[PDB]
C-alpha cells in the first residue's frame, strides 16, 4: 500500500521528471501525459498489469489514486 505508493513516487520523480505529494494532480499539471503514462504502466506491470479501460482521470488523477488502482488489482 504505502510501499506500492513509494515505488511509484520514486519512478515518477526519477525516470519521468523535490517532494511529490499523494494528492499532487499528475494530469492537471502535465506531470503525466499521453507519452509518459504508458511508460509508468510498462513498469507497474513489468515490476509489481493495468487495463486500457483504466487509462483515464479516475485511475491516474493523484499519486494515491494510482496507489488504490494497483492495490485493488489483487486477483
Amino acid at each position: 500500500g504505502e510501499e506500492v505508493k513509494e515505488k511509484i513516487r520514486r519512478y515518477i520523480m526519477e525516470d519521468l521528471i523535490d517532494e511529490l505529494d499523494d494528492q499532487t494532480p499528475l494530469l492537471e499539471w502535465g506531470i503525466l501525459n499521453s507519452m509518459n503514462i504508458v511508460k509508468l504502466m510498462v513498469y507497474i506491470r513489468d515490476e509489481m498489469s493495468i487495463p486500457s479501460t483504466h487509462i483515464t482521470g479516475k485511475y491516474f488523477k493523484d499519486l494515491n489514486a494510482i496507489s488504490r488502482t494497483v492495490e485493488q488489482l489483487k486477483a
Partner: protein, 503 residues
Amino acid sequence: KLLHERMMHSLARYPRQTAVVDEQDALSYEALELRIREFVAMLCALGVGQGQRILLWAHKSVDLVAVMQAALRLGVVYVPVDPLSPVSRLEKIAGDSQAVLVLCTAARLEELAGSALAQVRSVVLDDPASAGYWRNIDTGSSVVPTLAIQPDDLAYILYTSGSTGVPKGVALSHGNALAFVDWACERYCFQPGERFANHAPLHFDLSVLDIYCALNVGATVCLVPESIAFSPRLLTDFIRQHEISIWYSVPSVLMMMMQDGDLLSDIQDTLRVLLFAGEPFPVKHLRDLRAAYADVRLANLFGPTETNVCTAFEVGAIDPERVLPVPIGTAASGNQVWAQKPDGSRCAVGEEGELVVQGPTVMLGYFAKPAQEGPYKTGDMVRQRPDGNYEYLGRRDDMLKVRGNRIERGEVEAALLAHPQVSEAAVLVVGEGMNAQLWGVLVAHTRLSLIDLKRHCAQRLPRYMIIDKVLCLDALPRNANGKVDRFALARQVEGKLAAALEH
C-alpha cells in the same frame, strides 16, 4: 448556401437520422432542430445580437453543437475556448473578443466567480439544478430579429497561441468554412448515414470537417470525449462502438492507436476515410497504416487555422525505400497556392520558399486587428517537386509544433516570466515527433522546482503548453544585438543532454 442552412437542408431530407452523438446523449436532426430553436429563443431573450461574441467553455456536447448552430442563425459570433485550459487564459480571450456571454458547466461557475469575467453573463448547459441553467431563462416576452447574413460575415473565431501571451483570434466567415466543407464533401465523397468521429476539440479547425461536413450530408458526428484522450484502446473502441467511417486527427493520435490500441491487429472494418493533418507522419508508421487498411482512403491535409486546409495529398501506395514524409500535395478548398522567395517572386520547381495561399478559406483577419489583405503568407517553408506536389520543410519563426499542437515560444515564456522567482525565460523543443519535449531555460532571481513551475504554468496555459523539463542558467546566451541567442540556447540544452548520455 450559408453554414446554418446546410443543417436545415439535411433536416428536410433526414429528420429521423441521428445528427450528433456525445458520451451521454444523441439527437436526431429533428431533436437537434428543436434544441437549436430553443437556444435561439435564449440568445434573443438574453439580448445577444448579430456580431456580438459568446464564449463556449465546456467539454464537447450535443448542446454545444446546438448552441453553435443557434449563434450562426442569429449571426452571433461563437468562440470555442479549450475546456482543458484555465480561467486566466479565458480572461485573455474574453478581453480580446470582448464577448458578452459565457456558456459553461455548473462546475466552471466557481472559476468564473473569482475571475476578471465574473461580471460577464454565464449560463449553465449541463446541471438543471444550477440557478444559471439555460432553461431557467424566460423567453416568452422575446422575438427573433429580422436579419440576413452574407457568406463573408464573421461566423466564429478560433483563438491560437499569441507570442505576447494574449491568444490571437482567427476570425472566419461562412464562406471560409463552406469552401473547406464543400471541397472535402466532394473530394472524399461523404454520404448520408456516414459516421464522423470528432477527435479534435472545438477550438481547432479539424472539428469543422467533423461537425459541418457531417451536418452538410445528413450523416452523424460522434464527439470523442476528453475523458478517453490518453487511452489509445478506448479510442479504437470508440471507432468500433460508433461504427466510424470517417476519422480526422493529427498523426500522433493514429500512432498512439497503432502502438498501444491494436488499430493494426484489430482491423476497424467501418473506416472508409482516414484524414491526418497538423504535423508530419513518420513515413515508416504511415506505411504500416496504409498496409493494414489497403482499401481505405488516406490523405495528408495541410494548413494553419488562418487558411484551414489549403493543400492536400491522396496517399496511394508508398515506395518502401521512401524515408521522407509524403508530400502536403496540391491546392485545396478552391485556393491557389505558391512558394515565394523572400523578394516576392514565385519559386520554381526545386526552390525552397514560403507557402502563400490566395482563395476563399483565407481568414477575414485576426479579430479586432487589421483585415487580411491579399494572399496569406503561412510562415511554412515548402518546395514543389516536378509532379506539382509541395513538400513541407519547416518554419523559420517562434511557432512550435508538439504532436500537432501549435505553441508560440512567447506565450509559454510570458507565463514563466510572471513567476516571482524568474527574471529571464526562453522556451524550445528538444526531440522530434512522439519524442519531442517542451523545455524551459530560466534564470532565477535568487536560485525553481519543476513541480512548482508546472503548477505555475497550469494556472495560465493549456496543459499541452506546460513545460516537460527545466534547465536553470546564471544567464541566457545573447547575440551582439541584446536579443536571446536561441541557436546558442538550443546547442547548450542539446549539449548538456549529450553530456548526460556520455555520463
